[PDB]
Nucleic acid binder design. Structure first.
Ligand code: K
Ligand code: MG
Ligand code: MG
Ligand code: MG
Ligand code: MG
Ligand code: MG
Ligand code: MG
Ligand code: MG
Ligand code: MG
Ligand code: MG
Ligand code: MG
Ligand code: MG
Ligand code: MG
Ligand code: MG
Ligand code: MG
Ligand code: MG
Ligand code: MG
Ligand code: MG
Ligand code: MG
Ligand code: MG
Ligand code: MG
Lengths: 99, 132, 202, 101, 146, 85, 138, 63
RNA sequence: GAACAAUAGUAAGCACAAUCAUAGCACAUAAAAACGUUAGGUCAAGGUGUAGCUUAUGGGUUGGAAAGAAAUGGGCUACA
RNA sequence: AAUGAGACA
């Protein structure tokens, strides 16, 4: 390591665009923070979950429009009807145990 | 005893199609994959988005054609276009089949923002490979 | 009720041209294929299943639209959209003599609704240093300046750029590095005379 | 409706993180550098901790998109281990086969 | 246009009109759902973007009373909304460009101050003496060749 | 929660519970025959609660030589149709 | 006997811009099944020979990805079910290909790509020295 | 090259040392557009302008 | 419900077998292993029968689940 | 190498 090598190391860094002046090991992280995409903005993170609200709502409307027939939802409705017939249904608001 | 995607033996009176008659360890040995796409290659990304889209079509096609669907769909993805191959029983009148074909092609294309191809092959009944 | 018409295989001619039936890639239609093809593992004492109502013949990517008869017809029509490679550039050695810069770029195709691959922005520029006008002093400085990008055995200089989002920006940036590294190897700055006897390459 | 209340909480958490992702990055740059004065770094710590709790990348939890199993989830397919076998054993995933060697 | 499956192959010229129009009604049926609930199709994963697959809008995106919002109703094949809004603009006292007035007349004249043919909501002179086209034309302060 | 739903055959195969260990050695003495009801016995592809008349599925495509369009159903008419089911 | 007479209407405007010369073009197709890639190579070679490209075909070594998952849904960690994803490779090199011939060959190749495979193209474009380097500037 | 955006900064204090690290990092960033990069530079101008009294007691006077 | 110098058994289905994978074969290892047994394990992967809650056994925010007297299992590092 | 089973047909 000589003064000649220091100039060459800095001169090469200037042309290729790296940091010219000496930088600490911990101080290089700020370069890494902006060089890479932050974790919270990657497409794998914020788009991880498919939008179940649109998936559920769309098939809900198509079910009522007769274009999509869902067996599973029909099963719940058929059993729910039988519970009402047997006399065991869901009470309204303010009817659980206050009476 | 393994139970993954198997149909149990019950005398000799239950028909079984070719897909259901083979255990899952026979995949890539006797039967191929029902879906083919780039997502599950070695150095390719975008594999989770394809999987969720694949599952939705398994639930949409099964519900759009109630009872008249023969067996599982076959999904092929070439370029940005999506091809769906189905086996449908002779249940609905041909007027309703073309209505549902036209309805499915437009709705899926405007939902996934990609062109969709829907090819149908009609069979008189479910194809039986063993038993019966 | 509605009946099933006989398949068009019966009405298919013996000498009809196949590619007219399948112009584009289409799934295996049992009625549209005259070939009696059977696939699937046979029963203990039996034969593999027929071509009608069989899923195994539907999963396979068919090559009926790329028959060798159709390939010659397809390719010959495309011969209009072509231009010949210059005959003088026959030997690879002459290519280096007349063109000393080669640039590597990559394009990726995948099945999906999006084409954006972040690995397609890379540009690799390789230059043979023996074809340049470097002096004895200028060439030595360039090697000491570029670092490990220069191979001492093959005398090739490889510059790889990834920071620019697009391949065209990287290509313009890659050529910018090549020209600024050459105009700088000829500037014998004052401090260059402070050479140490341990830093000499020879 | 998401499959569970836990899944709904994660969506809110991811959404909040995205809004404050850039603002956190700018402030966090001051803290992680030792060349700035120590007085300024102490003020930055107060501001970065004053941001809403849900806007933290570490609080993001990777679940299954189908059954919302908090663990046993492959990162590539974003699916639980049980659901992955259910899809793969039926041949519904391309290129996935039982390993034999 | 028709499927290659024998059960779906048309067998007569009568079937061709019935089969093809059934498929055409399917596209209209789906597009009605797309336009009815725009919020279920706003998600975009198409790269490059495809503007021919995004849902469209027919209701006026601007509910305010202004000249700029008035032009939106004119271009969206809306007649009743345009005529009601134009009257409010005139009562508001704000000036209206002649070309916009001419453009409003062209929409009303072509359909006879009526709505066009939509998916869902010969003999004799169709033109009527008591029509809005003549009424607005007389009210025009300046009348050009067009 | 659309992905959370299952097939009709899967639901009935579990609700009936006619394959467990209870009905093996007389352990199950319920003596009441649980009955399976095919929920697709009454189906009109196109019919819905909102009552949309889709040309091609329920109503005929062509009416007096004129192809019908999408239309809804009156409230009184829809009530009677549901009362029929 | 009845055929549409002269149903061809493409135009190829020959401009004045010099064409781009590619030293060598590399195509690497990756897929799950060898049989598809074996047939695809034959299609690519047959089309390449007719255009006069003098291509060479070689098979890079394959790589296998393996991972292990639990078997049951509760306890029983001594029993595992494994899986495997196999990616088979095939490379088609193109040498001395002009830019105009490159565009048609690639797009014809890409449109006929099977659904179960994908490919990567590495084009080694060649060109002369930059103006600053060529023109003497100290 | 983002030097033209650093004209209004103290040329000799630690601000230049810190800012040139930010600009060097932004140069290597492929995922961010040019207009977004200027927003980061502008925010630092905003942040150092709002907090002026703290820099006076830091020990070095910075413009 | 079998006697091969044969005395009531017969041909198919599932399993074993054969085949396939581990880039030659072979061997070896993987993989496979039916019908049943233990009301074996899992309502907390998810779904669901029946029973229960509904201004509460539901939802959200903040903070906190410490600690090892002692006993034991499977491991890493050693006692050169 | 003395002992064990309850509300399973
Ligand atoms: K329950
Ligand atoms: Mg739940
Ligand atoms: Mg710290
Ligand atoms: Mg975590
Ligand atoms: Mg059980
Ligand atoms: Mg045997
Ligand atoms: Mg072997
Ligand atoms: Mg062996
Ligand atoms: Mg084993
Ligand atoms: Mg075996
Ligand atoms: Mg128990
Ligand atoms: Mg036990
Ligand atoms: Mg237990
Ligand atoms: Mg539950
Ligand atoms: Mg519990
Ligand atoms: Mg329940
Ligand atoms: Mg609570
Ligand atoms: Mg002890
Ligand atoms: Mg252990
Ligand atoms: Mg040691
Ligand atoms: Mg005793």
């Amino acid at each position: 390591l000589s003064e000649y090598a220091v100039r060459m190391s800095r001169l090469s860094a200037r042309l290729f665009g790296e940091v010219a002046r000496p930088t600490d090991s911990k101080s290089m992280k700020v370069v890494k923070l902006f060089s890479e995409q932050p974790l919270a903005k990657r497409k794998e993170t914020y788009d991880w979950y498919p939008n179940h609200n649109t998936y559920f709502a769309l098939m809900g409307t198509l079910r009522f429009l007769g274009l999509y027939r869902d067996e599973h939802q029909d099963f719940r409705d058929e059993q729910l009807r039988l519970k009402k017939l047997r006399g065991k249904g869901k009470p309204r608001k303010g009817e659980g145990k206050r009476a | 005893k393994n139970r993954a995607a198997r149909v149990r033996v019950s005398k000799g009176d239950k028909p079984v199609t070719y897909e259901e008659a083979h255990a899952p360890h026979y995949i890539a040995h006797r039967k191929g994959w029902l879906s083919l796409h780039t997502g599950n290659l070695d150095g390719e990304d975008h594999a989770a988005e394809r999987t969720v889209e694949d599952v939705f079509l398994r639930k949409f096609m099964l519900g759009t054609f109630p009872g008249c669907l023969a067996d599982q769909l076959v999904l092929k993805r070439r370029a940005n276009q999506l091809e769906i191959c189905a086996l449908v029983l002779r249940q609905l009148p041909p007027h309703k089949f073309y209505f549902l074909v036209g309805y499915s092609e437009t709705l899926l294309s405007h939902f996934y923002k990609c062109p969709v191809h829907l090819h149908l092959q009609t069979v008189p009944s479910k194809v039986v490979y063993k038993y019966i | 009720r509605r009946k099933a018409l006989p398949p068009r295989t019966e009405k298919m001619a013996v000498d009809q041209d196949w590619p007219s039936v399948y112009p584009v890639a289409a799934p295996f239609k049992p009625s549209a294929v005259p070939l009696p093809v059977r696939m699937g593992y046979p029963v203990k004492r039996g034969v593999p299943m027929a071509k009608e109502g069989n899923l195994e013949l539907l999963k396979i990517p068919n090559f009926l639209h790329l028959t060798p008869v159709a390939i010659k017809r397809h390719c010959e029509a495309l011969k209009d959209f072509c231009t010949e490679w210059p005959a003088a550039l026959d030997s690879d050695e002459k290519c280096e003599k007349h063109f000393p810069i080669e640039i590597d770029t990559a394009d990726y195709v995948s099945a999906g609704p999006s084409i954006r691959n972040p690995k397609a922005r890379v540009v690799t520029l390789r230059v043979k240093l023996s074809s340049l006008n470097l002096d004895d002093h200028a060439k030595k400085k360039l090697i000491k300046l570029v670092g490990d990008r220069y191979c001492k055995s093959t005398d090739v200089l490889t510059i790889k750029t990834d920071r620019c989002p697009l391949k065209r920006q990287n290509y313009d940036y890659a050529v910018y590095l090549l020209t600024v590294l050459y105009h700088e190897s000829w500037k014998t700055e004052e401090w260059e005379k402070k050479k140490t006897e341990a830093d000499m390459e020879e | 409706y998401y499959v569970d209340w836990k899944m709904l909480r994660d969506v809110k958490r991811r959404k909040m993180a995205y809004e404050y992702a850039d603002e956190r990055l700018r402030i966090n740059s001051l803290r992680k550098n030792t060349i700035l004065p120590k007085d300024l770094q102490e003020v930055a710590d107060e501001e970065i901790a004053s941001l809403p709790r849900d806007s933290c990348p570490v609080r993001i939890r990777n679940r299954c998109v189908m059954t919302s199993r908090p663990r046993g989830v492959k990162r590539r397919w974003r699916l639980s281990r049980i659901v992955f076998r259910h899809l793969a054993d039926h041949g519904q995933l391309s290129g996935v086969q039982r390993a034999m060697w | 246009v028709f499927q290659d499956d024998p059960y779906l192959i048309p067998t007569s010229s009568v079937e061709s009109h019935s089969f093809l129009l059934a498929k055409k009604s399917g596209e209209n049926a789906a597009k009605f759902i797309i336009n009815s609930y725009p919020k279920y199709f706003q998600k975009d994963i198409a790269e490059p973007h495809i503007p021919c697959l995004m849902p469209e809008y027919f209701e006026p995106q601007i509910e305010d009373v202004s000249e700029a919002a008035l032009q939106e109703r004119i271009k969206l094949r809306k007649v009743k909304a345009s005529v009601d809004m134009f009257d409010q603009l005139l009562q508001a006292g704000t000036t209206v460009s002649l070309e916009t007035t001419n453009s409003l007349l062209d929409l009303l004249c072509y359909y006879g101050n009526q709505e066009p043919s939509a998916n869902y909501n010969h003999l004799g002179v169709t033109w009527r003496t008591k029509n809005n086209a003549e009424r607005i034309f007389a009210l025009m302060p300046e009348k050009n060749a067009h | 929660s659309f992905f959370t739903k299952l097939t009709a055959d899967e639901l009935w195969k579990g609700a009936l519970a006619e394959s467990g260990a209870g009905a093996r050695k007389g352990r199950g003495k319920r003596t009441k025959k649980k009955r399976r009801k095919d929920l697709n016995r009454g189906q009109i592809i196109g019919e819905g609660r909102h009552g949309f008349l889709w040309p091609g599925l329920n109503i005929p495509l062509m009416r007096n030589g004129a192809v019908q369009t999408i239309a809804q159903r009156s409230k009184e008419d829809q009530e009677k149709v549901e009362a029929d089911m | 006997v009845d055929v549409p007479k002269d149903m061809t209407k493409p135009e190829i405007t020959i401009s004045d811009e010099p064409d781009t010369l590619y030293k060598r073009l590399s195509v690497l197709v990756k897929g799950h099944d060898k049989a598809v890639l074996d047939s695809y190579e034959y299609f690519a070679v047959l089309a390449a020979k007719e255009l006069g490209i003098s291509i060479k075909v070689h098979e890079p070594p394959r790589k296998i990805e393996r991972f292990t998952l639990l078997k049951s849904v509760h306890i029983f960690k001594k029993h595992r079910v494994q899986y495997e994803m196999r990616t088979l490779y095939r490379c088609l090199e193109l040498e001395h290909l002009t830019g105009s011939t490159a565009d048609v060959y690639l797009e014809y190749i890409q449109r006929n790509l099977p659904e179960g495979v994908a490919m990567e193209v590495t084009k080694t474009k060649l060109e002369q020295l930059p103006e600053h380097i060529r023109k003497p500037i100290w | 090259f983002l030097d033209k955006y650093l004209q209004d900064f103290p040329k000799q204090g630690p601000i230049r040392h810190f800012m040139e690290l930010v600009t060097c990092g932004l140069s290597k960033n492929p995922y961010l557009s040019v207009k977004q990069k200027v927003e980061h530079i502008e925010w630092f101008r905003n942040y150092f302008n709002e907090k002026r009294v703290i820099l006076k007691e830091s020990g070095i006077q910075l413009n």
